[PDB]
C-alpha cells in the first residue's frame, strides 16, 4: 500500500491533499467495496470498505480524508516454551510445571459419497495462546514448543474505532479519536484536512514490553530474523501493563509514532522512520518501529516529494499512473554497461536488446525488457555484495545503488544471472514482440482485460501482483481502491476508481466497468455532494423498509 498526505506548505492550493493507494487482494474477504454513508446532521462519509463491515475503512468527509497502509509493527508475540522434562504436554513458568489446555473442535466433512463425517481436532493452548508449529524452525519436541499471543484477539474496539473515524471532523479530531480508543489492528493511518494538516500515525494495537525487559525477554536468534519471539518460561516476560493503554498489555498511544506536519507525510509499508526524512521517527520499541532500509516504493515516493516545488493533484495521480519501475534506476544503467561490454555473446543478445529498448515502465505498451528485468532482479537479489554502493544508514534515500562491476567476481555472477534470466524468459512461451499488457490481465467471464502495473518489490508505485494461470499472468492483488482528495471551496473533490469494479459477480453491470477504466488509467469523480450525485445521468434511487 502507498499513502501520501500533503499539507499547506507544499500543496498547490495551500490546503490539504491525500493520495490513497492501498494494495489489497482482487478477490475474497479483503476485496474493497465503495460506499457513501449519511445520517443527516451527524455522519457523512464516503470511501471503501472490506466485505461485511458496516463502516467506511478508507475514505473522506467534508474537511478530512484518511487512508491506511500495513505497518511494520508486531501485533503478536511468539513465546518459546521450556517444556517439562518429564512431560512434553507441560511447560515451565518460573520453574513450575503447568499443563497445556486441550480444546477440541469438531468439523463436518462432506465425503466422496456425499455424506458428512465428523472430524475432531485437538488444539493445545498455553497461558499465552495456542501452540504453533513451523516444521524445521518452530518445532514441538521434548525440549521446547512455541505459543502465539495475538494482541488483537482482545481488541473488541475495532468496529467502534472505524465508525469513530467516520465521524471525525479534521486531522486533530481524527488523532484524538484513534489515540483514545486504540482500536486499529494492524495498519498505519495517514490523513490530510482542508486546513492543510498532514498526519501520519503508527497507531495500532502493539504488544507492550517495558524497555528494560527486552534484552532478557527476546529470543535473540529469532528476533534477529524478524520474529517477535519472547521467553515464555519467565513470568516477567508477560506483556507489561500500563494504565494509559486502552487494553491491558498493549502499547499506550503516547509511545507510538505520530508525525503532524504541514509539508508531507508518506508511507509504503516501511517503518515510521522515514515518513518524512526532515523529521525522522526514532527511539521506539523494536516491536513498534525500527530504522530499516526503506523499500523501493518509498524511495521512489521520496524522490518525487522532497524539495520545494508545490505538489498538484495531477502530480500525485501521475506517481501512480506513470508505472515507473523505480528499481531499474538503481540497477539498469550498470546492467546496460555490462550488456555493451558483452556484445559478442549470443546468450545475452535478446535480453540486452529488450532491456535497451525498454521504457523502464510497467505500462500496457512497455516492452519485454520488463520481463527480462524481473527475472534478472530475482537472481540479483540472491547475489552477495553485488551493490556498487551498499545501503548506507547515513544516506538512507540514495543507497543501495549500482552494480559492483569493479569486482571480477560480481561481474561474473551478474553476467551469469542475466544469462540465466534470459534462458528462463526464452524457455517460456512469450515472443519478444509481446508487450507487458499482452501478458498481465484480469479475467472477466471468458474475456481478459490488460492490467498496467507491476510488483511493488520492483519499485512500481502502482503495485500489481500476478500469478501464471493458463497463458497469462492473472492479477491477484495490488492497486484496488484509489482515492485522491483535495478540498476546493465548494466541497471535497475526490478522484479515483475501484480497479476490480464494485461487483465480484459476472452477471452484474458493475463486474468489469471500472476495470476497463483502470486498464486505460482513466480515474473518475467520486461524487460526494448532493449536487454531484444529482448531476450523474446514471443516478438510480431505491427506498426500502421492513
Amino acid at each position: 500500500s502507498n499513502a501520501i498526505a500533503v499539507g499547506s506548505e507544499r500543496s498547490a492550493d495551500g490546503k490539504g491533499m491525500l493520495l490513497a493507494n492501498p494494495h489489497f487482494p482482487w478477490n475474497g474477504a479483503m476485496r474493497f467495496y465503495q460506499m457513501h454513508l449519511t445520517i443527516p446532521g451527524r455522519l457523512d462519509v464516503m470511501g471503501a470498505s472490506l466485505p461485511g463491515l458496516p463502516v467506511v475503512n478508507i475514505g473522506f468527509s467534508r474537511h478530512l480524508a484518511w487512508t491506511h497502509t500495513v505497518d511494520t509493527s508486531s501485533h503478536f508475540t511468539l513465546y518459546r516454551l521450556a517444556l517439562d522434562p518429564k512431560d512434553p504436554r507441560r511447560y515451565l513458568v518460573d520453574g513450575r510445571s503447568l499443563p497445556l489446555e486441550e480444546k477440541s473442535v469438531a468439523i463436518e466433512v462432506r465425503g466422496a459419497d456425499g455424506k458428512l463425517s465428523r472430524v475432531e481436532h485437538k488444539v493445545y493452548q498455553s497461558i499465552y495462546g495456542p501452540l504453533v508449529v513451523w516444521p524445521g524452525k518452530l518445532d514441538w519436541n521434548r525440549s521446547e514448543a512455541y505459543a502465539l499471543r495475538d494482541a488483537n484477539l482482545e481488541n473488541t474496539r475495532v468496529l467502534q474505532q472505524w465508525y469513530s473515524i467516520n465521524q471525525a471532523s479534521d486531522v486533530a479530531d481524527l488523532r484524538r479519536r484513534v489515540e483514545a480508543l486504540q482500536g486499529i489492528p494492524w495498519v498505519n493511518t495517514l490523513a490530510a484536512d482542508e486546513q492543510g494538516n498532514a498526519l501520519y500515525m503508527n497507531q495500532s494495537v502493539v504488544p507492550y514490553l517495558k524497555p528494560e525487559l527486552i534484552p532478557a525477554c527476546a529470543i535473540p536468534q529469532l528476533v534477529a530474523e524478524g520474529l517477535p519471539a519472547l521467553q515464555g518460561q519467565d513470568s516477567r516476560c508477560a506483556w507489561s501493563r500500563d494504565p494509559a493503554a486502552a487494553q491491558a498489555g498493549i502499547t499506550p498511544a503516547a509511545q507510538l509514532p505520530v508525525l503532524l506536519r504541514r509539508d508531507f507525510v508518506q508511507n509504503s509499508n516501511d517503518s515510521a522512520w522515514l515518513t518524512n526524512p526532515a523529521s525522522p521517527l526514532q527511539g521506539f520499541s523494536p516491536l513498534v518501529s525500527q530504522e530499516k532500509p526503506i523499500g523501493p516504493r518509498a524511495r521512489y515516493a521520496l524522490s518525487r516529494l522532497q524539495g520545494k516545488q508545490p505538489l498538484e493533484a495531477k502530480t500525485l495521480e501521475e506517481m501512480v499512473t506513470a508505472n515507473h519501475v523505480f528499481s531499474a534506476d538503481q540497477v539498469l544503467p550498470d546492467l546496460l554497461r555490462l550488456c555493451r561490454d558483452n556484445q559478442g555473446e549470443k546468450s545475452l543478445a535478446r535480453a540486452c536488446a529488450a532491456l535497451a529498448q525498454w521504457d523502464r515502465g510497467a505500462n500496457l505498451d512497455s516492452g519485454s525488457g520488463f520481463v527480462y528485468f524481473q527475472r534478472f532482479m530475482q537472481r540479483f537479489a540472491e547475489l552477495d555484495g553485488a551493490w556498487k554502493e551498499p545501503f548506507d544508514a547515513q544516506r538512507p534515500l540514495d543507497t543501495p545503488q549500482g552494480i559492483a562491476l569493479d569486482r571480477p567476481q560480481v561481474a561474473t555472477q551478474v553476467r551469469q544471472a542475466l544469462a540465466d534470466a534470459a534462458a528462463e524468459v526464452e524457455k517460456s512461451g512469450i515472443p519478444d514482440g509481446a508487450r507487458w499488457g499482452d501478458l498481465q490481465v484480469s479475467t472477466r467471464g471468458q474475456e481478459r482485460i490488460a492490467i498496467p502495473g507491476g510488483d511493488g518489490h520492483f519499485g512500481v508505485y502502482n503495485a500489481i501482483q500476478s500469478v501464471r494461470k493458463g497463458d497469462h499472468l492473472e492479477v491477484v492483488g495490488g492497486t484496488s481502491y484509489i482515492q485522491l482528495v483535495t478540498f476546493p471551496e465548494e466541497g471535497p473533490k475526490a478522484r479515483g476508481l475501484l480497479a476490480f469494479s464494485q461487483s465480484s459477480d459476472p452477471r452484474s453491470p458493475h463486474y468489469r466497468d471500472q476495470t476497463e477504466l483502470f486498464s486505460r488509467q482513466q480515474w473518475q469523480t467520486l461524487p460526494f455532494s448532493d449536487r454531484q450525485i444529482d448531476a450523474d445521468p446514471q443516478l438510480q434511487r431505491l427506498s426500502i423498509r421492513e
Binding site: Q34, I39, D150, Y163, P509
Partner: protein
C-alpha cells in the same frame, strides 16, 4: 423492524445510503452490498464459520488459499460461541445497530433475489445471515496481522511421540 434506508446509486454502481439511525444505515449497506456481492459474502461467511469442508469437501481451498479442513479447524477455534458472545457484549449500541441492520438488509436482498446479479442462486450455502456471522468476519480480519497468519501452524501443532 424500525429498518428503513434510502439508496442512490451513481455511475459504476456506487451506493449512497441515507438513514436516520445506525439500524437503517446498516439496512441500506447490507442490501446494496448483497446486490453486488451476495455470493462473495456467503462464501467468506462459510469460511469464517469453519464450514468449508461441510459444503465443499476436503480437496478445496478458501479464498485465502488455505485447505478447507485446516481452515475450518482454525475458524472453529477462533470463532467459538463464547468468543463471539464476549465480542458482542463488548459492542456499543451504535455498532450493534449497524450490524443488525446490515444482516437485515443483506437478508432482504436474498429474499427478493431472482438471479439478476446473483450467480449462486439456489446454492445451499447462500442463506440468511446473522449478526454472529458478521462478528465471525470481523474476527477473521482482526487476526490477519497475528494468529491468522499462523492458521496452518496452529493446526499442525501436535505433541511429540516416542521418536529418536
Amino acid at each position: 423492524t424500525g429498518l428503513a434506508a434510502d439508496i442512490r446509486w451513481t455511475a459504476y454502481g456506487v451506493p449512497h445510503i441515507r438513514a436516520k439511525d445506525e439500524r437503517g444505515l446498516g439496512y441500506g449497506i447490507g442490501y446494496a452490498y448483497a446486490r453486488d456481492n451476495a455470493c462473495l459474502l456467503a462464501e467468506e461467511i462459510v469460511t469464517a464459520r469453519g464450514e468449508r469442508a461441510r459444503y465443499f469437501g476436503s480437496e478445496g481451498k478458501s479464498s485465502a488459499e488455505l485447505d478447507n479442513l485446516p481452515s475450518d479447524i482454525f475458524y472453529a477455534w477462533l470463532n467459538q460461541p463464547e468468543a463471539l458472545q464476549a465480542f458482542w457484549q463488548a459492542q456499543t449500541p451504535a455498532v450493534r445497530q449497524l450490524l443488525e441492520g446490515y444482516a437485515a438488509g443483506f437478508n432482504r436482498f436474498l429474499r427478493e433475489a431472482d438471479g439478476k446479479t446473483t450467480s449462486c442462486l439456489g446454492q445451499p450455502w447462500l442463506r440468511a445471515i446473522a449478526t454472529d456471522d458478521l462478528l465471525r468476519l470481523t474476527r477473521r480480519l482482526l487476526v490477519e496481522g497475528g494468529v491468522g497468519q499462523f492458521a496452518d501452524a496452529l493446526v499442525a501443532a501436535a505433541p511429540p511421540g516416542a521418536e529418536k
